Amino acid sequence: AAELPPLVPEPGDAGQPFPLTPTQQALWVGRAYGYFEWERPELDLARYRRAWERLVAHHPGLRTVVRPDGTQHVLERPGPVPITVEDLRQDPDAVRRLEESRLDPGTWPMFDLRVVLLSGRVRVQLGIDLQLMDASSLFLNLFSDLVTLYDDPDAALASQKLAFRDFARWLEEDVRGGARWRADWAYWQERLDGLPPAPDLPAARKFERCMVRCPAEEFALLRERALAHGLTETELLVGAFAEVLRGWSSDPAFTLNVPVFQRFDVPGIEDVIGDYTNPILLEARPEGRTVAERIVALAARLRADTRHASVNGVEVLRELARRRGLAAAAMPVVVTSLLGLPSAARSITEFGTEVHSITQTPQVSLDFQIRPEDGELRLVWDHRSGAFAPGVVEGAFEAFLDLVGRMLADEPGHGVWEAPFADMRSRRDRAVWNETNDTAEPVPAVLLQERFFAQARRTPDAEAVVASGLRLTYDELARHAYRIGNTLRERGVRPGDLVGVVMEKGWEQYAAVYGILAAGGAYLPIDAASPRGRVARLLESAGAGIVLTQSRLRDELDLPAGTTVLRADTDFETASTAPLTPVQGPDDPAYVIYTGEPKGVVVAHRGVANLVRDVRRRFAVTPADRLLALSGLHFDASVYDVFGPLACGATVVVPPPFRRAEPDVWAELVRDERVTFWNSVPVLLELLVGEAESRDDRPLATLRLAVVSGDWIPLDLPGRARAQAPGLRVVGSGGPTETICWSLFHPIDAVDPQWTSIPYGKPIANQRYYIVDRDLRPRPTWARGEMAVASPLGLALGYLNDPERTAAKFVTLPGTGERAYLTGDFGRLLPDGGIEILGREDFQGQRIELGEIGVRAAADVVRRLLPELPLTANGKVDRLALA
């Protein structure tokens, strides 16, 4: 170690100023205060006055003021003690007037006394500055003596050696810079680059207090638990607190201010009112497998942070601001612990029983206070209401109390102690997620091509496909599907093969899909606009043989000779209109769709069929509904346009092929065919509604359902669309291609203005949406995390054939065992249950949050400005081309 210089007392010349202490320096600039309240039957005010008159002397603090020159001197003739008695005994509505309630160091009384007189009862209130003295002083000296002094104001008091002004000049001059000081600034200079920012907890873009009183018996068990791991009553208590926090914490590592109220064991200093406040920056990095392990390890780093106490935290934090940014250093999370200081003479409880007590420490968002009191350990969480999203503190406190409770119930080395983690979600956190994720419904085994075949037999007259003017009935499509599918099986389209379907938008694709499924295979959609090289590339990498195509642009297909190619509009006509029989199963693949290297997606039958018959049972999909099949069949979004409508008698309406979005034709074709179902990415319905508003007719007037998904549903768009056809119910969805087109549905009924984004929603039937930390564990509400869509049948079979990708992105959760897809999107659960979608590794997102109230950063805007934003291949918003 290193011994320190001795304190030089000065019996006199105390009237002359001494500089402000570091903990105090930081409060006298933020001005550019605590409060208590006890009750008791009768307060003898004269006695009380004289007590407080003697309490204003003795301690050189209760008189000190701050000269506006930035220094503090003592006073010696202050005035009389300003006690402000209020009277409300014969006042009815006395609780009401008492209710409305709540300072400068330039002006003597560094506080604010009061005494409100209610009927039969007296309510003593004490303001106080927090620049004036510190927590330990307040409880160990002021209150203690004040009890002594209310009892007998003339009672003997203690001889005040070496007044505080001395300690002040002492640490400032004699102690700073010396042996122990120089030794200790190294530690923090050799860790200042290892310090993790403060707890990053959720916000929601005055002071409230949860507290709990532990009885004496429960105290002592608590302490006993602490020693049995070699910890102190405050050692374990910080450790637990770190755990709770990690739950909602948006990273496991953070830094906890743990101030220490040291006086360097000076003789007589435990009787001086002063600011002995030394912050310590405890680094919380989860070190260990178990609680017992991780709490014991953080306890270690605390003590080591403590043997180096001479360098005040204020400096360390300063130098921290120097190395990094200023704001990127704030320590809003603190743990004030008056355990382990001496047992004072008197306990404020003797005087009167509390009623109110809120520390107003500023720049502190959450203040875990640990103080003992007449036998009990008082735990208290004082938190700045509005620093965090709703409930976040109510929930962590519930979870905290459980954690400590189990520790009161588990013999060390057993139970929670040797538990690898602890689920912080509160009873509601759970109730809401269970209740919103209870999606358990059996899917009837029916081949996706069988369902359609059976509706075609059910309503063969009906309009199945309307494409490029040439319409098609359900029987004529079915008959041409039989034609194709028979032809395929004949050429050996064995069960489980992939028949690549490469064409443009038209009625050829539809029959192509249902003949290929019929033939016992799965269809592999490839865009006819891709480069003449990438097409054959995807086909070769998927190992696909036969390829169906339209005859137009059939020669513009550079494919090999081992891969057969047939036209659909002609190279089929001379076939069997006799139905083929289902050879393939419900768990066999129906389509592979492709998406740093592109990955193919394998999708079953069972899941798509789950989709189809939910969407029908969600929005009452009736055969009257006529749908604008806008998405390209190579985009995952097209799948409801294939199998959705035809599986209960609706009509599919194919628009003329495009490359650039053409909301003109779309408004036309929607206006003309009485289209009632719109399905695309949000920008496409935006462009449509923009073209439609600027028209005299009502073109989009028959629309009864609009499902946007895959991008960001623009905040205004639901109203702007709801503008035309009064009665359209807009709905937004999404979920990755590996999750069967739509997974989570949010009916867009009332865009909230203070929303950064449209809620992602509640899950559909059979899919469960989880929000997990880095450990694939469920998070509690609001918490950021990655999204895990859990599902036996509504999950993608696998990533093409590469098993690495598939077993790495499709995991088993350890909480349950559910096979889940790690979406690679990050979000947070919402206390109605829905999900808020936040981006994908977008944490460095505000942007639109502070934008619409125009794109994101990288910044770009459109109305480095630019005319209008660029799209991607199927629409959305090309955030990758923008830098």
Ligand X SMILES: [C][C@]([N])([C][O])C(=O)O=P([O])([O])O[C][C]1O[C](N2[C]=NC3=C2N=[C]N=C3[N])[C]([O])[C]1[O]
Residue numbering of the annotated binding site for AMP: 710-711, 733, 737, 825
What pairing do the DSSP bridges indicate for beta strands 547-549 and 565-567? parallel
Backbone angles phi, psi at 97, to 5 degrees: -70, -35
Q: Which one among 840, 848, 851, 870 touches ligand X, defined by CB under 6 A? A: 840
Q: Report whether 611 contacts 794 (CB < 8 A).
A: yes
Find all residues with CB under 8 Å of 173, minimum gap 6, and list them: none
Instruction: Give min distance, CB of 670 to ligand X, in A.
Output: 20
Choices 218-226, 242-250, 331-339, 733-741; region in contact with ligand X by CB under 6 A: 733-741
Burial of 654 (0-12, 13-18, 19+ CB in 10 A): buried
Choices 342-350, 356-364, 809-817, 823-831; region in contact with ligand X by CB under 6 A: 823-831
Q: Which one among 710, 763, 780, 834 touches ligand X, defined by CB under 6 A? A: 710
Nearest to ligand X of 341, 522 (CB atom)? 522
What pairing do the DSSP bridges indicate for beta strands 677-680 and 705-709? parallel
Interface mask (CB under 6 A) for ligand X, residues 14-43, using x and -?
A: ------------------------------
Instruction: Give min distance, CB of 713 to ligand X, in A.
Output: 8
Choices 318-326, 459-467, 719-727, 821-829; region in contact with ligand X by CB under 6 A: 821-829
Nearest to ligand X of 636, 691 (CB atom)? 636
Find all residues with CB under 8 Å of 628, minimum gap 6, and list them: 653, 655, 666, 669, 670, 675, 677, 678, 679
Does 825 contact ligand X by CB under 6 A? yes
Instruction: Give min distance, CB of 641 to ligand X, in A.
Output: 11
Does 736 contact ligand X by CB under 6 A? yes
Q: Report whether 296 contacts 289 (CB < 8 A).
A: no
Closest CA to 526 of 602, 657, 630, 634: 634
**Lookup result for tokens 């009064």:** 726
Choices 137-145, 194-202, 242-250, 704-712; region in contact with ligand X by CB under 6 A: 704-712
Report d(CA 325, CA 833) in Å as an integer: 37
Nearest to ligand X of 307, 537 (CB atom)? 537
Nearest to ligand X of 429, 711 (CB atom)? 711
Instruction: Give min distance, CB of 711 to ligand X, in A.
Output: 6
Instruction: Give min distance, CB of 782 to ligand X, in A.
Output: 19
Instruction: Give min distance, CB of 585 to ligand X, in A.
Output: 24
Instruction: Give min distance, CB of 592 to ligand X, in A.
Output: 12
Does 737 contact ligand X by CB under 6 A? yes
Instruction: Give min distance, CB of 788 to ligand X, in A.
Output: 12
Report 570-609 residues binding ligand X (CB under 6 A). Answer: 595
Report d(CA 729, CA 616) in Å as an integer: 15
**Residues forming a β-bridge with 115:** 85, 124
Distances 47 to 42, 111, 146 between C-alpha atoms, Å: 12, 20, 11
Instruction: Give min distance, CB of 538 to ligand X, in A.
Output: 14
Give the 3-state secondary structure of 378-389.
Answer: EEEEEECCCCCC
Q: Which one among 718, 735, 827, 833 touches ligand X, defined by CB under 6 A? A: 735
Choices 345-353, 364-372, 461-469, 730-738; region in contact with ligand X by CB under 6 A: 730-738
Nearest to ligand X of 453, 742 (CB atom)? 742
Does 824 contact ligand X by CB under 6 A? yes
Encode 408-417: b = buried (16+ Cβ within 10 Å), e = exposed. eebeeeeebb
Choices 74-82, 238-246, 620-628, 708-716; region in contact with ligand X by CB under 6 A: 708-716
Report d(CA 225, CA 212) in Å as an integer: 19
Report d(CA 83, CA 49) in Å as an integer: 8
Question: Phi-psi region for residue 526, left (φ > 0), alpha (ψ -120 to 50) or beta?
Answer: beta
Residues that constitute the known binding site: 710-711, 733, 737, 825
Report 128-157 residues binding ligand X (CB under 6 A). Answer: none
Does 767 contact ligand X by CB under 6 A? no
Instruction: Give min distance, CB of 796 to ligand X, in A.
Output: 10
Nearest to ligand X of 443, 741 (CB atom)? 741
Q: Strand, coil or helix: what is 52?
A: helix
Choices 252-260, 538-546, 729-737, 794-802; region in contact with ligand X by CB under 6 A: 729-737
End-to-end alpha-carbon separation of the chain, Å? 55
Q: How many residues bind ligand X (CB under 6 A)?
A: 16
Q: Which one among 199, 515, 632, 734 touches ligand X, defined by CB under 6 A? A: 734
Does 385 contact ligand X by CB under 6 A? no
Nearest to ligand X of 166, 711 (CB atom)? 711
Helix (H) or strand (E) holding 49, with range, is helix 45-56
Nearest to ligand X of 519, 611 (CB atom)? 611
Nearest to ligand X of 335, 685 (CB atom)? 685
Find all residues with CB under 8 Å of 217, minimum gap 6, and list them: none
Q: Which one among 636, 641, 673, 836 touches ligand X, defined by CB under 6 A? A: 636
**Residues forming a β-bridge with 690:** none
Nearest to ligand X of 404, 611 (CB atom)? 611
Instruction: Give min distance, CB of 638 to ligand X, in A.
Output: 9
Nearest to ligand X of 586, 682 (CB atom)? 682
Sign of CA dihedral 132, 136, 138, 142: negative
Q: What is the DSSP letter of 362?
A: T
Instruction: Give min distance, CB of 741 to ligand X, in A.
Output: 4
Nearest to ligand X of 164, 799 (CB atom)? 799
Helix (H) or strand (E) holding 693, with range, is helix 682-693
Does 709 contact ligand X by CB under 6 A? yes
Find all residues with CB under 8 Å of 19, minimum gap 6, and list them: 70, 71, 72, 168, 169, 172
Closest CA to 21 of 108, 106, 132: 132
Residue number of the CB atom closest to ligand X: 734
Instruction: Give min distance, CB of 599 to ligand X, in A.
Output: 9
Distances 883 to 597, 624, 857 between C-alpha atoms, Å: 20, 46, 10
C-alpha radius of gyration, the chain, whole number: 36
Choices 473-481, 688-696, 716-724, 735-743; region in contact with ligand X by CB under 6 A: 735-743
DSSP string, 491-558: TT--TT-EEEEEE-SSHHHHHHHHHHHHTT-EEEEEETTS-TTHHHHHHHHHT---EEE-STTSSS--
Helices and strands (DSSP H and E) totals, the chain: 24, 35
Q: Which one among 245, 837, 838, 871 touches ligand X, defined by CB under 6 A? A: 837
Q: How far is CA 408 from the centre of its chain?
A: 30
Closest CA to 740 of 683, 695, 791: 791
Interface mask (CB under 6 A) for ligand X, residues 341-380, using x and -?
A: ----------------------------------------
Instruction: Give min distance, CB of 879 to ligand X, in A.
Output: 10
Q: How far is CA 436 from the centre of its chain?
A: 18
Choices 178-186, 283-291, 773-781, 818-826; region in contact with ligand X by CB under 6 A: 818-826
Does 637 contact ligand X by CB under 6 A? yes
Does 741 contact ligand X by CB under 6 A? yes
Instruction: Give min distance, CB of 736 to ligand X, in A.
Output: 3
Report d(CA 357, CA 804) in Å as an integer: 58
Nearest to ligand X of 140, 609 (CB atom)? 609
Question: What does the binding site for ligand X look like in residue numbers (CB under 6 A)?
Answer: 595, 636-637, 709-711, 734-737, 741, 823-825, 837, 840
